[PDB]
């Protein structure tokens, strides 16, 4: 069970905390979706689908930085959704492709701020993923642990709209 | 205004090398990071190189890595792509950029006056 | 890697009428595409970044969209110096690749 980042990094069998660095959109007015669409930037395969056959899970989500300061949003993974860190356990997709194979994951954000200037600070840790896997074959259990790092810091539309 | 100052053309049997200068005026060096994009000439653009704002990320696109490598001194405000191990025509308007690199959003802001690369016998 | 598919030609056009630009992505970036005006072997320069939000030097008669795989540039009103080439680039998936450029042409 290999996989590989978009940006070259790649956890080899068995495990690993790997760093994703993902772009985000310079300005998001009130709630537009500020999504991350890893759906382009991870990619896990199989070694030997004749007996291997991998399944994939969301096992846990957390978030960090002015996430945590004032935003909100949604999660997807295959057809579904969730709200932020994901209190339960989502279910599995199976991974029986030796092949590239993007992972459909998103991270959903909307602004609950009022009257606010910068946001998701920039170098920073955005959130956490941990990618279990499990098989048919054997009781393997592991953590595939993807850092979001943000790459620029969003910018909330500036003072203004308001009456008397 | 902020200006790309660039210098240090010339034609390169392939196999060679050659040190590409840019400098920069206008702005603080240390708070924005440099890239370097080939413009061939009213053709095809192509994304040359990358490097942080303190010089510790660094990624080449598949065409160039493996013959390039890129270095700035913050004080010395002179960007220097060192590129070797010449092949495939390579004959492009080499052009340092501002962009603006990790931890802001790539745009390729603010543009120089650019060195030609050209590779014959 | 992920091919920025422009028209391979020219869109005609001539004065004070609407210029649209075409840039096509084979696959999926998820947002933010940049826009550039390049003249006659010239610096490009940055117009419209994130395919949504204008750029400072750039006249209000610029923007453009796009989401998903498709992407387009828009002129309100082409003056006279307007015309030259125009870039579309991705930098959402590495190696970011920029698109073929799309010239303007005055119809006379």
């Known amino acids: 069970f290999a996989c590989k980042t978009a940006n070259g990094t790649a956890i080899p069998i068995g495990g690993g905390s790997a760093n994703v660095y993902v772009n985000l959109a310079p300005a998001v007015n009130v709630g537009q979706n500020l999504v991350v669409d890893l759906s382009t930037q991870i990619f896990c395969h199989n070694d030997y689908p004749e007996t291997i056959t991998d399944y994939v899970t969301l096992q846990r989500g957390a978030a960090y930085g002015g996430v945590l300061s004032s935003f909100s949003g949604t999660v997807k993974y295959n057809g579904s959704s969730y709200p932020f860190p994901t209190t339960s356990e989502t279910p599995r997709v199976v991974y029986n492709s030796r092949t590239d194979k993007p992972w459909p994951v998103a991270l959903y954000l909307t602004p609950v701020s009022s009257a606010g200037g910068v946001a998701i600070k920039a170098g920073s840790l955005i959130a956490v993923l941990i990618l279990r896997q499990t098989n048919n074959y054997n009781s393997d259990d592991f953590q595939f642990v993807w850092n979001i790092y943000a790459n620029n810091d969003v910018v909330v539309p500036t003072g203004g709209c308001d009456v008397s | 205004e902020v200006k790309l100052v660039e210098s240090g053309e010339g034609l390169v049997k392939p196999g060679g090398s050659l040190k590409l200068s840019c400098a920069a005026s206008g702005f603080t060096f240390s708070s924005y990071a440099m890239s370097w994009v080939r413009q061939t000439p009213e053709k095809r653009l192509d994304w040359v190189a990358y490097?942080?704002?303190?010089?510790?990320?660094?990624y080449y696109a598949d065409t160039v890595k493996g013959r390039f490598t890129i270095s700035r001194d913050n004080a010395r405000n002179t960007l220097y792509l060192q590129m070797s191990s010449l092949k495939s025509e390579d004959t492009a308007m080499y052009y340092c950029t501002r962009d603006t690199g990790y931890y802001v959003s790539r745009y390729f802001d603010v543009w120089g006056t650019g060195t030609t690369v050209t590779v014959s016998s | 890697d992920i091919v920025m598919t422009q028209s391979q030609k020219f869109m005609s056009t001539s004065v004070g009428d609407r210029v649209s630009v075409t840039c096509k992505a084979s696959?999926?970036?998820?947002?933010?595409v940049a826009w550039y005006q390049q003249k006659s072997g010239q610096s490009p320069k940055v117009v419209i970044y994130s395919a949504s939000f204008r750029s400072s030097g750039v006249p209000d008669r610029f923007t453009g969209s796009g989401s998903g795989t498709d992407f387009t540039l828009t002129i309100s009103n082409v003056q006279s110096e307007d015309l030259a080439e125009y870039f579309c680039?991705?930098?959402?998936?590495?190696?970011?690749?920029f698109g073929g450029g799309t010239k303007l042409e005055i119809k006379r």
């Open positions: 490097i942080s704002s303190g010089g510790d990320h660094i």
């Open positions: 680039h991705q930098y959402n998936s590495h190696p970011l690749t």
């Open positions: 696959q999926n970036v998820v947002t933010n």
